[PDB]
Design a protein around this ligand. Sequence first.
Ligand code: HEM
Ligand code: HEM
Ligand code: HEM
Ligand code: HEM
Lengths: 147, 147, 142, 142
Amino acid sequence: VDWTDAERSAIVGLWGKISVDEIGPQALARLLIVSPWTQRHFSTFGNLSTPAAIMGNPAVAKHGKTVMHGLDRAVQNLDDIKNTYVTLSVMHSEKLFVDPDNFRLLADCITVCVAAKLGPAVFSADTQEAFQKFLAVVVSALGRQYH
Amino acid sequence: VDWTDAERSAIVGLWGKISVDEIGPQALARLLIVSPWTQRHFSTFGNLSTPAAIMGNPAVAKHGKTVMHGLDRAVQNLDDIKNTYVTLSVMHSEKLFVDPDNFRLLADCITVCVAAKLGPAVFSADTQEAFQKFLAVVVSALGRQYH
Amino acid sequence: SLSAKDKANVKAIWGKILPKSDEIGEQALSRMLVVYPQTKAYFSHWASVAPGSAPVKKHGITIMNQIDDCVGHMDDLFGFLTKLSELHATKLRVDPTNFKILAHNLIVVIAAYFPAEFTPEIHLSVDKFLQQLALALAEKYR
Amino acid sequence: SLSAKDKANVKAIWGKILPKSDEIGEQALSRMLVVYPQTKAYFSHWASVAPGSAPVKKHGITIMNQIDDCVGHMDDLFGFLTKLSELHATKLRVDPTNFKILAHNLIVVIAAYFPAEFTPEIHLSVDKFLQQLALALAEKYR
Ligand code: HEM
Ligand code: HEM
Ligand code: HEM
Ligand code: HEM
């Protein structure tokens, strides 16, 4: 990937100004409601029968946090994201049997939650351009070891 | 992109058994019919009033050949496809204003035409896997310079 | 298909969107163009495709006015959109995969402007609505 | 929605497909699994996802029998597929983006088996048919 300086600064600045422990739970709950087939992977996590149950589910919240913290390492090295996620990709494929299209859907929910938190002036079109590029590279990397 | 030896072998072997001069015209004519919004770009190419007219159109045919031979250098160096298409990418973006989703649709037509030409034994599932991967890398490269 | 609950949710959030319709259209279109520059292929005849430029503001209004009107036609979105589908297919020749791109960007904008109101349930209903709108726009293709 | 010409084209090519329906199902499913391995996520409980293997042959028949029957219901595909839609959504939890992937592989297989007959016009009608079939399978989601 070939990041512009503007893109790098936008991503690092954005990441530093959100609370991943806040956004993660929000994004994962949003994914389970808006893309409900994803519930396939979380039935051991308690009550998911209604939107309210999902939003108040503490197991879902903890998992949303680990997802977001999983993105930290990508932010910490924008130039080696493919290698960062090699083993996580193998895991989601071979152990977890996650349809990698759900990575794209989760990334879209993260965008929505970040936009809601930051607002349209701070999360400007150019900031969204950089963050979308970042998410696309991560999603590609997470799907890379599926065979 | 990381190619397995099998994929590399299958791409080179497949490319060697087709006539780009035959498949190109078939693929492009097919695109214009199956994804007819693509005709936006070829209205100066003469008779496109009917599928029969498109199929018999020698300007479309000449251009289908050009498209296919454009894939030759990708096959020649599978490890540098991104850089092979830089010039072509900006031309299609800034001069021709081609929606790059149409590269995906053309690639799918190329797959259909190759399968029709070679049949299901020669164009096996593993050969299709390698060719699809190749086409996806090409399509990404063609859209690379869109800003 | 939209349920009665989906329709009610769409109408409720549009109560918030309506007073800011022109601005939300500008924002959504601007983001589509900048974040998904593949879409610029259709707009090279404009004087600008920059966020907040005159052509983007003007067309942002055109898009959002239409979507606002669709909220009043949720019982038959396909019939309502027939002429507009024909226009996009035959006159403009827009690859219909782009419709979901605009939908995504509108969702992002609604979230940005109305964070407390744009709950996951509202988001789901709005997504269902915009997906149906996209399919209605695709109906007269090919 | 399909025109009468589309429906006639689908029926005409299905006349070629039907005598080889089982083989075509297994080819289409095998290619989905191998060429688009994202799809393997739903089939880890099978003994094999290898082309031509027993589970792939068996399920290829299941899929093609259903698509064969759809050809006889082109006037109301959505109604015909309502229960199968709710099954994929609720029982199997298949991400509906996959339906288009199966459609593409079926098209590749028909081309491979019937190259002379699978003209661009036939291809267009079959694609329109399979896209409607995919939408019908997605109709009862969410
Ligand atoms: C932004 C994309 C994603 C990232 C960065 C991510 C990252 C991670 C990480 C770091 C783990 C912990 C692995 C370990 O324990 O060693 C994990 C586990 C897991 N992930 Fe993902 N993931 C993503 C998307 C998804 C999606 C979309 C799903 C399913 C819809 C999913 C399903 C799971 C499951 C089921 C586990 C194990 C759960 C458990 O044992 O409690 N992941 N993921
Ligand atoms: C596999 C994907 C494609 C490849 C490899 C490709 C390659 C090429 C090449 C090599 C040229 C000639 C460049 C030159 O003159 O120096 C060209 C021109 C052109 N291509 Fe593409 N192309 C692809 C897809 C498309 C698609 C999908 C469209 C539109 C639907 C398109 C529209 C055009 C047009 C309009 C020209 C210029 C024709 C003219 O001279 O009037 N191309 N392309
Ligand atoms: C999905 C929601 C959309 C809605 C509700 C919508 C609505 C409209 C309307 C009402 C017009 C004016 C038509 C007229 O002249 O009477 C228009 C024009 C147009 N649309 Fe769309 N549209 C949508 C999506 C898109 C997308 C995604 C694209 C391309 C990426 C697109 C491309 C165009 C173009 C190029 C024009 C002509 C504008 C000009 O020439 O200045 N539309 N649209
Ligand atoms: C688009 C055309 C499709 C058709 C016509 C179709 C049809 C069917 C039918 C008739 C069944 C049997 C249902 C029953 O038990 O009564 C079934 C099962 C199933 N389908 Fe689909 N399907 C399609 C696409 C897909 C796709 C794309 C996927 C995932 C990639 C999928 C995943 C499954 C799974 C996992 C089963 C259960 C198989 C098993 O557990 O052995 N289907 N399908």
